Amino acid sequence: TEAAVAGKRDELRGLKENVIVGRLIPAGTGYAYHQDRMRRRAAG
Amino acid sequence: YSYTEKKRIRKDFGKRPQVLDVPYLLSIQLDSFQKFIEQDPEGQYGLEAAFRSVFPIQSYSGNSELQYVSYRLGEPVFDVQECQIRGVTYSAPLRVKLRLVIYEREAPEGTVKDIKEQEVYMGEIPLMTDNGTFVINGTERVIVSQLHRSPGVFFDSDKGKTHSSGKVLYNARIIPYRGSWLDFEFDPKDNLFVRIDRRRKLPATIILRALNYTTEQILDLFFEKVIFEIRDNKLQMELVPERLRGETASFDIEANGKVYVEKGRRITARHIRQLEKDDVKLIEVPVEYIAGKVVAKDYIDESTGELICAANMELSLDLLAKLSQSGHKRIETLFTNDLDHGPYISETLRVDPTNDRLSALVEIYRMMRPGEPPTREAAESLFENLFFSEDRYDLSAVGRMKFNRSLLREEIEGSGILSKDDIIDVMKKLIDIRNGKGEVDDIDHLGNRRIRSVGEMAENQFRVGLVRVERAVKERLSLGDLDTLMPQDMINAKPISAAVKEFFGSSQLSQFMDQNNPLSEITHKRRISALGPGGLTRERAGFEVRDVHPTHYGRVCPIETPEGPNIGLINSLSVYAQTNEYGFLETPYRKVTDGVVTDEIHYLSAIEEGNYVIAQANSNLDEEGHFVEDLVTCRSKGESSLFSRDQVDYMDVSTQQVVSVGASLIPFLEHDDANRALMGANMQRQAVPTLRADKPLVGTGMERAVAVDSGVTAVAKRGGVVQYVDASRIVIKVNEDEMYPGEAGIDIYNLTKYTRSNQNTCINQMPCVSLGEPVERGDVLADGPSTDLGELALGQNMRVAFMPWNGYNFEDSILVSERVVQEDRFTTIHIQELACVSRDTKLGPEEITADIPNVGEAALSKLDESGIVYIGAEVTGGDILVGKVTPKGETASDVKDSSLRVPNGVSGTVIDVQVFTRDGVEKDKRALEIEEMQLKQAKKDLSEELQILEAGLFSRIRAVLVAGGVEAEKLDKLPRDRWLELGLTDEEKQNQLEQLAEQYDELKHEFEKKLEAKRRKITQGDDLAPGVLKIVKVYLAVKRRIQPGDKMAGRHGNKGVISKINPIEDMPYDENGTPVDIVLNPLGVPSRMNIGQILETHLGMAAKGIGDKINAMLKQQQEVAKLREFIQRAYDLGADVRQKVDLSTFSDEEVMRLAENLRKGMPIATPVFDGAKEAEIKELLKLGDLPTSGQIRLYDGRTGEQFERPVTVGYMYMLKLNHLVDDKMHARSTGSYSLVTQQPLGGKAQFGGQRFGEMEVWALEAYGAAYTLQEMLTVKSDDVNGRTKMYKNIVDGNHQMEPGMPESFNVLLKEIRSLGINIELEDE
Amino acid sequence: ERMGHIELASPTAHIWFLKSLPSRIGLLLDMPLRDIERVLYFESYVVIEGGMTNLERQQILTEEQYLDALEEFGDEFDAKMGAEAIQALLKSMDLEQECEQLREELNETNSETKRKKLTKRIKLLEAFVQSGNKPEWMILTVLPVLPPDLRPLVPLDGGRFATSDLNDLYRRVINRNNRLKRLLDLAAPDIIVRNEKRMLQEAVDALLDNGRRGRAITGSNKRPLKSLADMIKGKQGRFRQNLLGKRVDYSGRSVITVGPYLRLHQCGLPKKMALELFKPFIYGKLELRGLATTIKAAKKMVEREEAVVWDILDEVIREHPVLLNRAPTLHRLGIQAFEPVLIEGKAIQLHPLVCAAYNADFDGDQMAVHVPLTLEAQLEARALMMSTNNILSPANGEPIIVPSQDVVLGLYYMTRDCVNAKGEGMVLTGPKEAERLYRSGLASLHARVKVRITEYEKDANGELVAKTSLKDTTVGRAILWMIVPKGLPYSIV
Amino acid sequence: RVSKAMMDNLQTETVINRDGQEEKQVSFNSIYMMADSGARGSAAQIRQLAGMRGLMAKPDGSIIETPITANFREGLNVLQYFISTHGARKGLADTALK
DNA sequence: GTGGTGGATACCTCGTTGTGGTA
DNA sequence: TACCACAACGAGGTACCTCTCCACCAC
RNA sequence: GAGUGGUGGAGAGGUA
Ligand SMILES: [Mg+2]
């Protein structure tokens, strides 16, 4: 209710939301992929 | 002894002479249901009580009423085996005769208008078996007794609620048996309140305000009266000496000439002695003492006619001036104290905004039904209905007992509703509790919790159903036709039968029966559950209800509870624990008589136990003299202490009476810790019966009690000699002494061969008597599933060594020899039922036939021409048992093949096929063959019945012939079958012969007509499910040998899992050459503290030493005198043993049969808490020519050499539990899927996968295996495209992963979007 | 994936924005929840606007006061009752004007509780004007319908159809919406149409959250119905039941037992579970070895269980790990990956060192076997979750592969010493001669002897010097020193 | 005192030796060995086996007046076992809430 | 068979969070 | 107007296995 | 264009 009122968005940077959504987690092995994807998305 | 008791005399070790036999262990179920169903016209219990408590019932005007006449229960048209097979309730019809008497409205009471009476049929109440089990829908269910809080009043107090103050708040509560509660409580301001059924608080005086009471009655009822008297502008105080206790003097309380107290001085008890020794009454009191007091009664001025002051007003100087000028010379005043009479009711009267009964009733209706537009008649009707309606409030005859005996009264009767003085006295005791005199109640003291059993619950459900049908039939009769209406048209039999069937089928307490073994049945019947309707839950009941209250001593076992979330909510009933009249629990106790315990047995309930002092069973008695020690031990007043040998009142009745049945079956109970003995007494309840039942050598003497009273053996009814014993049935010829002459003199004991249990184990009955062998009444004849000769025999006893063995018994693990498998000591039988139904689609009925398409001779070759497996073909998993096919198109066109298959992992033979049908489909060759075999076996068995019956009735007619006249030579010179044609002159014996021949022909008539009844019931269809045609049921019977993974356990909570089946050469042996069978783990003993297995291992080795010496003497065949001497010396052994057996009364063949029965060991009885001490065990071992410590010197079969230290070896009784590794192991590669979330299923039946839960997701997260977590949440799970690419890629050899958004996340998106909150996936 | 919509006749209130405390309407309109509840219970009227001085804006009136206002003015004001009244009020309320009024009215006095409520309302209004939502949108006019395959309808075995709760809830709201439609085009009396509006409002509040507003409407089987909020939230809601933890394919389960003959990285998988778990790998190897051409022939060749299938399984298993999970997987080391070895039987064999990490006792504990599929997951289960990599627990740098109770009894019995047992005071060349003596039996395990031990001191760098002297020890300690590697001193043993 | 005498009379018992003298050493007793190596159980459990079981507690936080003067070799009587069940059921409900 | 549909139990234990009451 | 009882909502362990039972009405 | 239903939900009991 509060998030719908405020119109929030989630940046998808935690392990719980990346486990819900279904990508690699931003830890362990997947941290290299996540910093690569975030520098690609910042780079264009 | 009996003839079966001479067959094997179990040696005792107990020393206390037991004084009471073990009671009939199923008395609670049978006595409660017999009280529910039995016709009591005087002592109203059950059905007659409910009928008379609802009948009669009149109309709205009163011109017609229904009178109850009588009721009778007919025969069940099916017996219990037929109901178990067919899958239906075993029940009797309830036929009630009922009278309709119509009244006239022309006359004032025109009773003679029209008389009508008939029997109306309503309801089908289910009956009980002989041994306390109900049979519903074919299955055997058991209704567990319930332990709710009894009706009445319970004064309680929560300690530490207002954490700022920490004050105690005593709260009362009136729990009735039926209706609504009534809760009084204080606040931290010490104001009484009323909370009817967890609504808001109300000022507590409003109930008695609604009860037509004014404030004057309130103050004179609750507060004691003090009197001020104004005289010539001074105040005279009438003073009783019981008022100045523990306070400070406001003024100088003096006398006419005596001084007692000073200013600001505490009134002392010596000063009170001075006042009671001078005995003055009137004392003058100054003006400042009045300021603080409160006026009792109203004072209206006589001149102006208005009220100077009402009741409950604070006095002041202007107020006393107004009273003196009005002239009220006598002043009534309340008594206010802080010690014994606190200002509580006065404060609630002050804060109470109501004034009269009208405002009280509209306020209480505004609370009870809020928001409704209130009125006076609705408020008063709901108030009468809420407490003082007989049809809306019942607590009688047990709550009336507890209410009077908690209100310090004497009589145990009264009315079934509350009343004014009753609520007044409850409030009075609450104020006494609040000021200090009295004592609060605890809530788990067993004078408060009451056993509510199956009879009471069934009567309550019958009463609720009858009330609903009474309301319906009154709504019918109030306007319907009077003269031309029979009552069977107006009594709808629907809600009674629906209610009783609902209770016996789907209640909280009618639960499915675990019958792994007779112990499980008996301790599932004697079970005390505290859950269900009216009791607590398995969430909302913390440490208080679970803990062992000290009044559980003797009534409830302390070491038999489940270990799950029901750690104290499921009590088990102790051995000797009976039930009261009202329903409380009670134990037997022996009365002392001037220091002598006379064997008259007084029963003590939970409350009457507390006032006496009770001695303990371990207290010694000197041959019916007195105690030895002057300071005996006792338990008293809720604890334990010491007392004198004359001050006592009662002694224990035995020493088994603390523990229940199951924990009494454990030997050496007094040496196990309570945790591990609880683990053992729960793991004896799960022992699958093995192939040949084998007795325990170390028992407790309760085994014969469990196997007899568990109702699974075939115990004789009248003693006699056996006439013919078979493997299928035993018949017996009765003694002529124990025969009544009206009968024929032959009982028949049919046995149930290889029938499925409720947990798919086997149940059969092998006979234990041979032909030409006399038995007495109460003897055993046929052993049950896990019984050896009428003893309970759950597992097998086997050789045990206690040492580490190359790691293979590491952390509670068991290493089992090969010879345990080779002797097949642990191969159970599992009988499994598979069902096939011919449903009906709307394209034709499904066909059971062998012309199935798409199949060949790799499957159809086991089946017959009819499409049904033979009786006896060994199937394997996945083969067709019943070939069923379904019309696919309209009526090949039967293309879909819906045959049965054996589930993968099930094997074995097909012991029975049973086929049911509906009338409407014509049978086939297989159904005709099954019904022909049933017909022929029914005719065969009932004609054998007729044949032994004509043997008996020909004995009967030869008896009446030799009684009437003397006719012997023509009686035996002529065949016995033509004894109906012989006769003489017509007299009473001739007429008896004609009527007995007519009785024989009528026996033939009921014979052939019950054959025709079973014939038409098997040819005609049974009342099956809606929309089936014929039902074929098969029964597969595997034989489960042991293998690594089958759980095993002794009796003392030493569970294990079999780790290796070593060969006989690798098992350790001893120097004589005998290899040991189980190498247990020695480190299981010293920390878990179950020393019972160590003492039982030593005693088992002693027992086998004696049995081995007897086997040596028999195999050398020494002498019957040497056998008699050795066995007599073996029995007359202990110090002060209870039993005594002399073999001079035993014959030669008797002692030969006894030595043959003892050649496999000498069984021993170690009573729980009367056990065999280690000196007695070492005496037994010295008799056996063994090492006295029990430890022998084992060798090593692996490398030949010697173990360095002596190893303990004996014979512990190992079970085999119901956790079999074949049922446990399950795997899944790719299978079924759910519909909502598209993730795989869950469970071994649906072939589902293991839930990789949240904790395992955190495990992968904190490892960092991100790719493993992603592939475990997308492609191994709910993602259809990714999993299809994954499966295809793995088959092609390349392991690569294309992920995607999971289907459960898409479900969550659709659910929030349908909830109305716009959630979407924003790109970049 | 398709959605439906319901045209509601009357507007209605979303119960989340009425009963999720604080309701956001009770803080939006600055009115108490009791008054808004009495409006939506259809028991009282509120004027929207009034030109007279008697009726101020947002003044709640009872029905008697309502009809008194009708006989007094009747024309100038407008007092309505129900969700359309609060919908019109939400339309008429000006967000920027009232937040400016709040910002000018805050700064005069600063009392704590009223200042808190005022800054709560300013955060609400600023969040609304930031997000661009409308305050009118809290009132539902078009109620959406879930896709039909997420409230599915599969029957029972006997043809009787057992639905979900949502079909019943939607049936109730659709039937009462049709009856309200019939009464609006019939132009019913106002008491009847407001009673049916009450019942529609209660039905849609039940649909959005059953056990929330009042009496939860129970199902046909004497149980409360499951709403959309009860299908989302919970210990068995969608999140914590099917999103965080999923049931998974490629997974077995069995009773555990003890394998002392293993090594640190091995577990004994049964034949049957391994043949089931590695089934598509077996299909792939069968098609690669030219024996299988189609999927049906591969399926039936596995389900016939030939010796070529057993050989192919023995080749597939070779150095391909499996994850032996145990639940309750409390700490991090509850999942470890082992290279499986094939056994017959039906029970997973563990090492005895890892059953301290698992807190396993072999008295009937069951464990799961999860397979990794991809190359990334096999390399993660070899290089991260192997049993030989989590030696030390992450709670303390002290190892978790400690011997436990039986190895401990054996090593204690090895390294303890008696006084004059058998052959004490001998002199031995080393562990080889000492163990030859003990296995021959000429000297017991507790004789105090002298031995020559060539222990290896490791220096400051990684070089290994060899020193040699005579130590006065036990025969058992001399035998254990043969096991102890090169690099440790002797006072260890 | 009973626990101290028990641990002494368990620890130093293999005294029958020779070849120096009648020497006193640490014992090869099996219960003491399995408790002394750190294998299974500790001195409290050994005391409960051999010495004195001690003062068990009522569920209300109190201490019972009379202790369990027996142990798990001589075997308890009825009253000491009924006392012990208080601590047993308190432990096994403590595990559920814990 | 095919649309229609409204009433006679109580028996957790904290622990935050919001609300009318009153010195 | 700042403390304050009082009321209302919102938590309460993971994994597994076996069994039974499922809305009334109705011209 | 080529076989097929429990999960759903309740209640009761059990294992670690
Ligand atoms: Mg375990």
The three-state (H, E, C) secondary structure of B646-670, written as one string: CCCCEEECCCHHHCEHHHHCCCCHH
Resolution in A: 3.8
The CATH code that applies to domain B712-786 is 2.40.50.100
Type of residue at B926: R
All structural domains of chain B with their residue ranges? 24-150+443-573, 151-223+342-442, 224-341, 574-654, 655-711+787-826+1041-1224, 712-786, 827-921+1022-1040, 922-1021, 1239-1324
Nearest one of C256, C475, C473, B293 to C490, comparing CA atoms:
C473
Asked if B829 and B691 count as a contact pair (C-beta separation under 8 A), the reply is: yes
Asked if C325 and B1252 count as a contact pair (C-beta separation under 8 A), the reply is: yes
Contact call for D39 and C406, based on CB within 8 A: yes
Architecture of domain B574-654: Roll (2.30)
A27 has a chain B CB within 8 A of its CB: yes
Residue nearest to nucleotide E13 (CA to C1'): B540
Assigned token pair, B451: 């056993």
**CB-based burial of residue B1139 (10 Å sphere; 0-12 exposed, 13-18 middle, 19+ buried)?**
middle
* Window B1103-1142, strand G contacts by Cβ < 7 Å: none
* Closest chain D CA to residue B1083: D40
* Window B875-894, strand G contacts by Cβ < 7 Å: 888
CA C390 to ligand 1 center in whole angstroms? 23
Strand-pair partners of B254:
B259
Q: Chain F positions under 7 Å from a protein CB?
A: 1-3, 5-7, 9-23
C192 has a chain A CB within 8 A of its CB: no
Greatest alpha-carbon pair distance for chain A in Å reads 36
Euclidean distance between CA atoms B766 and B769, whole angstroms: 9
DSSP label at residue B735: P
Residue of B16, B159, B540, B547 to mutate, interface with D, max D Cβ within 10 Å: B547
CA of C136 to C1' of E9 (A): 40
* Closest chain D CA to residue B567: D93
Enumerate neighbours of B (3 or more CB pairs within 8 A): A, C, D
Taking the C1' atom of every nucleotide in all shown strands and the CA of B197, the nearest one is E10
Euclidean distance between CA atoms B482 and B114, whole angstroms: 9
Residue B1116 neighbours by CB distance under 10 Å: 9
Angle at C483 between CA C478 and CA C484, to 5 degrees: 90
HEC readout, C272-331? HHHHHHCHHHHHHHHHHCCCCCCHHHHHHHHHHCCHHHHHHHHHHCCCCCEEEECCCCCC
Residue nearest to nucleotide E10 (CA to C1'): B197
Alpha-carbon distances, residue B1313 vs A12, B902, C5, C19 (angstroms): 20, 46, 11, 19
Q: Name the structure determination technique.
A: cryo-EM
CA B1057 to ligand 1 center in whole angstroms? 10
Residues of B with Cβ-Cβ distance to D55 under 8 angstroms = none
User: Of 2.60.40.420, 3.30.420.40, 6.10.140.1670, 3.20.20.70, which CATH number belongs to B922-1021?
Assistant: 6.10.140.1670
Task: Provide φ and ψ at A18, rounded to 5°.
Answer: -75, -15
Q: Which helix (H) or strand (E) holds B794?
A: none
Asked if B257 and B208 count as a contact pair (C-beta separation under 8 A), the reply is: no
Assigned token pair, A19: 């486990």
Q: What is the DSSP string of chain A?
A: -HHHHHT------SHHHHHHHTS--SSTTHHHHHHHHHHHHH--
Nearest one of C61, C121, C52 to C93, comparing CA atoms:
C121
Distance from CA of B1092 to the nearest CA of D (A): 9
Q: Chain G positions under 7 Å from a protein CB?
A: 3-16
Pairing of strands B578-579, B896-897: unpaired
Contact call for A20 and B1317, based on CB within 8 A: no
Q: Strand runs (DSSP E) across B970-1070, as ranges?
A: 1028-1040, 1047-1049, 1055-1061
Asked if C348 and C257 count as a contact pair (C-beta separation under 8 A), the reply is: yes
**CB-based burial of residue B611 (10 Å sphere; 0-12 exposed, 13-18 middle, 19+ buried)?**
exposed
| 3-state secondary structure at position C428 | strand
* Closest chain B CA to residue C277: B1229
Q: Strand runs (DSSP E) across B182-245, as ranges?
A: 184-185, 193-194, 202-203, 225-231, 234-238
Asked if C145 and B1314 count as a contact pair (C-beta separation under 8 A), the reply is: yes
Euclidean distance between CA atoms D44 and B1023, whole angstroms: 67
CATH class of this structure's domain D1-91:
mainly alpha
Asked if B650 and B602 count as a contact pair (C-beta separation under 8 A), the reply is: yes
Assigned token pair, B987: 């007299």
Euclidean distance between CA atoms B274 and C284, whole angstroms: 111
Taking the C1' atom of every nucleotide in all shown strands and the CA of B896, the nearest one is G3
User: Of 3.20.190.10, 1.10.760.10, 2.40.50.150, 1.10.10.10, which CATH number belongs to B827-921+1022-1040?
Assistant: 2.40.50.150
Asked if B1055 and B811 count as a contact pair (C-beta separation under 8 A), the reply is: no
CA B45 to ligand 1 center in whole angstroms? 49
Euclidean distance between CA atoms B399 and B1062, whole angstroms: 65
In sequence order, which residues have a C-beta less than 8 Å from that of residue C300 and are 6 or more positions away?
none
CA atoms within 13 A on the CB side of B275: 22
In sequence order, which residues have a C-beta less than 8 Å from that of residue B214 and are 6 or more positions away?
none
Q: Does C363 count as an annotated binding residue?
A: yes
Asked if D51 and D2 count as a contact pair (C-beta separation under 8 A), the reply is: yes
Contact call for A41 and B1324, based on CB within 8 A: yes
User: Of 3.90.1110.10, 3.20.20.120, 3.40.50.300, 3.40.50.850, which CATH number belongs to B151-223+342-442?
Assistant: 3.90.1110.10
Contact call for D85 and B558, based on CB within 8 A: yes
DSSP label at residue B875: P
Residue nearest to nucleotide F17 (CA to C1'): B1224
CA of B118 to C1' of G1 (A): 69
Residue D43 neighbours by CB distance under 10 Å: 15
CA of A5 to C1' of G3 (A): 52
Residues of C with Cβ-Cβ distance to B1316 under 8 angstroms = 14, 140, 143-144, 208
B1261 has a chain A CB within 8 A of its CB: yes
Chains D, A in contact, 3 or more Cβ pairs below 8 Å: no
Q: Which helix (H) or strand (E) holds B220?
A: helix B215-222
Fold equal for B712-786 and B827-921+1022-1040:
yes
CATH class of this structure's domain B655-711+787-826+1041-1224:
mainly beta
Euclidean distance between CA atoms B1123 and B724, whole angstroms: 32
Strand-pair partners of B1102:
none
Residues of B with Cβ-Cβ distance to D82 under 8 angstroms = 548, 553, 558, 658
Is strand E less than 7 A from the beta carbon of B399? Answer: no
Residues of C with Cβ-Cβ distance to B1275 under 8 angstroms = 373
CA of C170 to C1' of F26 (A): 25
Strand-pair partners of B644:
B631
CA C360 to ligand 1 center in whole angstroms? 6
